[PDB]
Design a protein around this ligand. Structure first.
Ligand SMILES: Nc1ncnc2c1ncn2[C@@H]1O[C@H](COP(=O)(O)OP(=O)(O)O)[C@@H](O)[C@H]1O
Ligand SMILES: [Mg+2]
Lengths: 107, 80, 95, 93, 588, 88, 98, 107, 93
DNA sequence: ATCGGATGTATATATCTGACACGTGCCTGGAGACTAGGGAGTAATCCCCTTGGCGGTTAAAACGCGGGGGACAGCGCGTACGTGCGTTTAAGCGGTGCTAGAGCTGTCTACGACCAATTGAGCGGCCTCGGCACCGGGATTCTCGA
DNA sequence: TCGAGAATCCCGGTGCCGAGGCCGCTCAATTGGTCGTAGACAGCTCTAGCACCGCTTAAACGCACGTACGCGCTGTCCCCCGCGTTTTAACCGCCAAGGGGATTACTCCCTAGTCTCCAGGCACGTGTCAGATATATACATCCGAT
């Protein structure tokens, strides 16, 4: 028969043979189940979709049509859950979320 | 002569502002120099160890990424 | 002539808005090689390694200054003093 | 020389969500590193989770539990929904 | 008469244990007692064949007893001369039995029926030990706190001369009592309590105890009871155990009590256990029973009221197999199938709904909260309770209600207030003075308290309720004797009118399961110890039949299957096989 | 009168009494304590417990058990970087 | 007049007592009730060991003690000797779990 | 032939066979060199000896001849680099290093 | 069943350093946890080191680099010295 | 207070220019097909440990009080920091010169895995006694109004 | 304004209970054969890293004025503490039960491993457009005088 990719059967976009290969030749355990690469690929794809959605939102909010690292880092820091997941992560060429202490403002 | 004095007064001032700081004492510059020096020594020591193991004599970016990851502060971008 | 405390806020906006590096390049690279000179002599650096080091240094110092600023404000002040660095750094957990 | 990457897959997902938006190269590297980092986090947690139970296989249950343990809040909810959906659709075929 | 006085200096040479380390196997006494043991009956060797393979010392013990292989005692068949009173014959018989055990260098559990005056037997026997055997003291006594005062009130009643005191009070007053009298050696008998005994171990070890009495012996069942552990350090000559009835639920219990009495015969559990359940096939179970009778016959003394003194309309019981009310149906389903409630440990939860659903969270509708007919409207046990309660009231019989959970007692408080009855409650949290006042007011000869509530666990104390005549009990207990003494509370010596127990029972609920288990245990006890010596009428008639069926079923079953206790899961109940997201508007 | 509706007081977080807060404070080394540290402390303690217990229960779920055994709690604390020596 | 210690001494005696002892400082049953009541949310019908609850209490008390030490440093840093909630918020925000 | 333990040949006191087995059935890698368990056992034994010596010194200072977790924490928290190694570690039934801030002492 | 432990070996080391001393049970449990934890840290770091360099074996050099990465300051050099001693002695059997 | 002024900032427009999205060919890794074997599923067993309730001792917690010392607001002052202008020095960019340092192919060969056997090291269960906890009493000491 | 009083360290005797020593039994570490293949080693190429000159341009240095703020003083008052009294609820001891945690045995499905085959993905060009940058304009804000 013709070869029909495991990704397509899953319906995902991220590879499954590649995830399978890494989980196997990565010394995580002796034997890798059949369904595990499918699950992991789906989860990685979902997280990527979230990050890119928020980042594209921010990029549009600056009249630009390309996510640059500043947009990634800004979108990540604005959200709370992504900000907690990547808490100890410094995104290179990101920057600081704009913030002024109210006490500092003139009166 | 005095490499850590290469961290000028205004550069520390820029970093302070990007942190959100308005007025600055005159004694902050010396302590900032000290803190930066300690951080650099830790990271550089671990990076040099990593490159020792691989028998090389250059510290590639990926070694520094590993060292930072080990310190407890990842760095997306350069690595991978 | 701007009243004192005016230019500072505009500096803060200028820098909290941008993304570039703030420390010069060569002074930091010299510092890196000089510090590394102890652990092993006759050692080379690939440039991307120094860029990584500068990014990490920038981020560490920026977060440190935010916590210093919070400590200063907590003591009913707007000036930052060395006691603030020391308090913030001890609380954070490296003393 | 072959440096494998999740470039084309990330770009497929991006075209899926924001159809007329690009992505830079530094942004691309950051996203790829992010995918690798979260991959090793999940895989390592699943490995430890199997070893704890004196088990010698990485099933899908271990992946699900690692997802529930690392991801915070409703990221966990939506991610487990996605994984379950994909594995079901897979086994059906 | 004929004894040295309480010269504390004289006593200190006898009370205090001079050789703080001196303790040996006592081969001679072991051999003497074990020889007499084998003399009266021969199976007792079955202990030694095992424990000798266990003990290198029992090698030579068995040897010594095996190479070899005042005829009448002082039949003290009179009221004791020194005790200032009179003794009814079986009292003297027990006294003679105690003396006879004393002579054979052993002792036995006294386990007579309650109200038979056991402590009088004990005081008489100790007085015998003093006046006749020229041994003043010391002795130790452990009792429930409630009866701490009774022991002394009768010590200073029959044999006034002897000295006794109580370690009653908190740390400072107990401590000064210790230092002044206890270590001053100014007594003959002590009276502590379970908690005290566990709390005054360090001084009370320092005495060459002659006996260690224990009122309510059955408290020593779990051989890892820290009370038991402590009592295994008090060096003594012999011991004594007093309990209304031993062998509460399990058979291992009696081995535990025997360990306390004679740890140099019953020293191992495996032999007892296997010898007992040593017939998987069931032709020799009668022989096993006769063996156990011929084993325990010497040690144990047991008496019955129903044969020592009549004048006691025996009691009678009915097990009203009540149905289930509607919300009880729904709540039973909800519990079985299914908001913090922690539904686990459900067999208690079932006992909650099966008595009254209001015990849960908001089963009664509201707020507002109102007392009205909706109480009894939908609680089957409470329905039949109201019906029978009215029938008793028109006859006018004071009623005692027992329960396991005091929350049901509070529900009954509300319901009693609803129905214009004066009730009286003595629960576990009641203060002592409140307790005595409440029981006195109920026991006033002119009392209007129709109902006297109390929990069944708290009912076993020294409280006396001979005044009433019906002792209705909501739910049967896990231990049939546990509530049997509660029922006895109203059937003690002094009650004339017939006692009319009404242990309430539900159908198809766990209540039948629990009742079956209780009946199994009660049958076990009876076998082992007996041979040693809407409309109320229609429900009554229906229930007086299935109870006959159950007692007939358990009337003759094999000992083996009697203790098997099939783990019949109650989880049937007619059939059952269980047990996007937020996005920021603008990122400018 | 009509009394069957008995409620519970000091719900469950008030069980961390004021003096216990003070004792923990003293071991911490403080001398004077304001009046609003008690509520703030109960809040922070409750948050910490929520996180740890959530991870412990996840571990218990996965092994198909129903008893949160000690080693699960050790694993959960470790996963948060609060390694605990002494329980396995 | 009765002997009455001046404000401050008894607190220092207590600090010495509790920095030299090593027992636990929160009562057992209240903490166990708190743990089970919290855990009712995530999975109904759970049962705990005992070592699990003791481990939880050890970790909890250690965490709170460290927090109070940092709180005290913050309070002293503001020219005070009294700890107030603002100190705790500052301490936790610096630590990194705001 | 007579069986001679691998520990004895190394001269150590920790087991090299057990460390070998744990290194193997641990999914750290798929081959474990012959000389790795030896070197690892030596390191573990050195650290054990160090911490135990400090703990015993503390115990004798407290006029005791056993070691209790309080002495272990005194040893660990009094030393400097050992304190860094066990930085995030909580030692159950340990206690706290005695310390009162100087400002709070009476005048 | 059969719980492995380091209790006996810890006792042998203790009798070496402070011959006239003992150790309670809790302290022994703590020491056992400490040993497993340090073994886990060293072995995990050596595993990562091998993976980073495409190696397939955990040799002595991996352990030495891992112990030089974990332990701080003086501990690192002393432990490295003593491990090297033991390896030379064993290999010169 | 308001206003006009000066300064800095947000906005629209034209230009580039360097990176991104695209297209191709090749190859290696994933998918199809098949076999063997062992890990995990699923029954079934045992008994260890958990679950709720109750009772008594005793210390801790809750409460109210009296009073002082510290948290906070207000004032003054003087000092060190900011702002702005003028100077100068160093970063950055570019270009010279070289070579060692780090990444690909092909061949051993020693060493780590697998397998059989078999013995001894280690684990569990059972003792006994000494180190620690408990207690009582006495001298020392620090605190606090005279 | 030092003597009274309350907390503390030390010593001493005693009790008790947990650590350490012994003893059997089993399985997993050692011996000892074999043998594959990782990795060590020696070819290969290629390219990025190392002490000197020249030049532009801006950021760093230095300095003077003033000012507002950090610091110190004072007062005030009110919150928090030390303490004595009373309630309450841990804590330990206890009773009951059954769940479910850990163990065993057997079968089979699923997974590793081999062969075979081909197509998804990766590196190498490549064209064009999204964004940076400069300019000029409009407008928003700050600030001192009236
Ligand atoms: N002369 C007597 N002969 C027999 N019994 C007596 C005599 N005098 C008093 N008694 C009863 O003997 C009882 C002894 O206590 P008892 O009720 O047997 O305690 P328990 O309930 O522990 O068996 C007393 O309560 C008393 O009523
Ligand atoms: Mg009695």
């Amino acid at each position: 028969a013709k070869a029909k990719t495991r990704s397509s059967r899953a319906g995902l976009q991220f590879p499954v043979g590649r995830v399978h290969r890494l989980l196997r030749k990565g010394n995580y355990a002796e034997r890798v189940g059949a369904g595990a690469p499918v699950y992991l690929a789906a989860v990685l794809e979902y997280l990527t979709a979230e990050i890119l959605e928020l980042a594209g939102n921010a990029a549009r909010d600056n009249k630009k049509t390309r996510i640059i690292p500043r947009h990634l880092q800004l979108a990540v820091r604005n959200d709370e859950e992504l900000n907690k997941l990547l808490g100890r992560v410094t995104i290179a060429q990101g920057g600081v979320l704009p913030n002024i202490q109210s006490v500092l403002l003139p009166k | 002569r005095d490499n850590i004095q290469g961290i000028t007064k205004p550069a520390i001032r820029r970093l302070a502002r990007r942190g959100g700081v308005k007025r600055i004492s005159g004694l902050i510059y010396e302590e900032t120099r000290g803190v930066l020096k300690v951080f650099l020594e830790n990271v550089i020591r671990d990076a040099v160890t990593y490159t020792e193991h691989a028998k090389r004599k250059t510290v590639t970016a990926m070694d520094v990424v590993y060292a930072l990851k080990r310190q407890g502060r990842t760095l997306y971008g350069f690595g991978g | 002539r701007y009243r004192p405390g005016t230019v500072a806020l505009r500096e803060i906006r200028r820098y909290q808005k941008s993304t570039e590096l703030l420390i010069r390049k060569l002074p930091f690279q010299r510092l890196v090689r000089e510090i590394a000179q102890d652990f092993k002599t006759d050692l080379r650096f690939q440039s991307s390694a120094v860029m990584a080091l500068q990014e990490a240094s920038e981020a560490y110092l920026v977060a440190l200054f935010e916590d210093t600023n919070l400590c200063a404000i907590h003591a009913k002040r707007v000036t930052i003093m060395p006691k603030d660095i020391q308090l913030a750094r001890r609380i954070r957990g490296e003393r | 020389t072959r440096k494998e990457s999740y470039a084309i897959y990330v770009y497929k997902v991006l075209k899926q969500v924001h159809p007329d938006t690009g992505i830079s190269s530094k942004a691309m590297s950051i996203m790829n590193s992010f995918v690798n980092d979260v991959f090793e986090r999940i895989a390592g947690e699943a490995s430890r989770l199997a070893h704890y139970n004196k088990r010698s296989t990485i099933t899908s249950r271990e992946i699900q539990t690692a997802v529930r343990l690392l991801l915070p809040g409703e990221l966990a909810k939506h991610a487990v929904s996605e994984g379950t959906k994909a594995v079901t659709k897979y086994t059906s075929a | 008469v004929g004894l040295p006085p309480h010269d504390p200096e004289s006593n200190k040479k006898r009370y205090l244990l001079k050789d703080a380390n001196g303790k040996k196997f006592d081969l001679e006494g072991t051999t003497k007692r074990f020889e007499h043991l084998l003399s009266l009956s021969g199976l007792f060797k079955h202990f030694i064949e095992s424990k000798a393979a266990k003990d290198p010392k029992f090698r030579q013990v068995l040897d010594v007893l095996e190479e070899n292989k005042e005829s009448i005692e002082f039949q003290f068949r009179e009221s004791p001369a020194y005790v200032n009173g009179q003794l009814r014959p079986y009292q003297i018989q027990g006294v003679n039995w105690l003396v006879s055990l004393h002579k054979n260098k052993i002792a036995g559990i006294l386990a007579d029926e309650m109200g038979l005056g056991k402590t009088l037997q004990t005081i008489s026997f100790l007085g015998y030990l003093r006046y006749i055997e020229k041994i003043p003291g010391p002795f130790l006594v452990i009792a429930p706190k409630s009866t701490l005062n009774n022991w002394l009130r009768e010590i200073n009643r029959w044999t006034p001369d002897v000295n006794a005191f109580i370690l009653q009070g908190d740390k400072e007053e107990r401590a000064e009592l210790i230092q002044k009298k206890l270590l001053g050696c100014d007594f003959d008998v002590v009276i502590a309590s379970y908690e005290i005994i566990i709390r005054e171990k360090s001084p009370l070890k320092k005495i060459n105890w002659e006996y260690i009495i224990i009122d309510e012996a059955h408290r020593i069942k779990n051989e890892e009871s820290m009370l038991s552990q402590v009592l295994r350090e008090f060096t003594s000559r012999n011991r004594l155990l007093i309990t209304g009835t031993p062998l509460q639920n399990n058979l291992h219990e009696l081995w535990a009590l025997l360990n306390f009495l004679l740890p140099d015969i019953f020293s191992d559990a495996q032999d007892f256990d296997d010898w007992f359940s040593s017939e998987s096939t069931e032709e020799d179970q009668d022989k096993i029973v006769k063996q156990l009778h011929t084993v325990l016959q010497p040690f144990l003394l047991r008496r019955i009221k129903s044969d020592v003194e009549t004048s006691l309309l025996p009691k009678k019981e009915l097990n009203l197999y009540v149905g289930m009310s509607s919300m009880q149906k729904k709540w039973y389903k909800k519990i079985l199938e299914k908001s913090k409630t922690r539904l686990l440990n459900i067999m208690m939860q079932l006992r909650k709904c099966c008595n009254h659903p209001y015990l849960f969270d908001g089963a009664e509708p509201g707020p507002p909260y109102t007392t009205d007919e909706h109480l009894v409207y939908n609680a089957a046990k409470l329905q039949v309770l109201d019906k029978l309660l009215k029938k008793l009231k028109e006859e006018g019989s004071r009623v005692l209600i027992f329960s396991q959970m005091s929350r049901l007692l509070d529900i009954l408080e509300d319901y009693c207030y609803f129905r214009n009855y004066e009730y009286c409650r003595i629960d576990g949290s009641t203060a002592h003075e409140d307790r005595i006042q409440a029981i006195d007011d109920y026991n006033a000869p002119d009392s209007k308290k129709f109902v006297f509530l109390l929990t069944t666990r708290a009912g076993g104390l020294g409280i006396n309720l001979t005044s009433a005549d019906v002792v209705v009990l909501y739910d049967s207990d896990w231990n049939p004797q546990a509530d049997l003494q509660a029922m006895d509370r109203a059937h003690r010596i002094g009650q004339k009118k017939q006692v009319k127990v009404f242990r309430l029972v539900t159908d198809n609920s766990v209540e039948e399961k629990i009742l079956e288990r209780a009946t199994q245990k009660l049958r076990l006890d009876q076998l082992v110890i007996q041979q040693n010596r809407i409309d109320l009428d229609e429900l009554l008639l229906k229930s007086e039949n299935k109870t006959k069926s159950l007692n007939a079923k358990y009337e003759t079953l094999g000992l083996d299957d009697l203790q098997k206790f099939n783990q019949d899961s109650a989880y049937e109940w007619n059939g059952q096989d269980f047990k996007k997201r937020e996005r920021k508007e603008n990122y400018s």
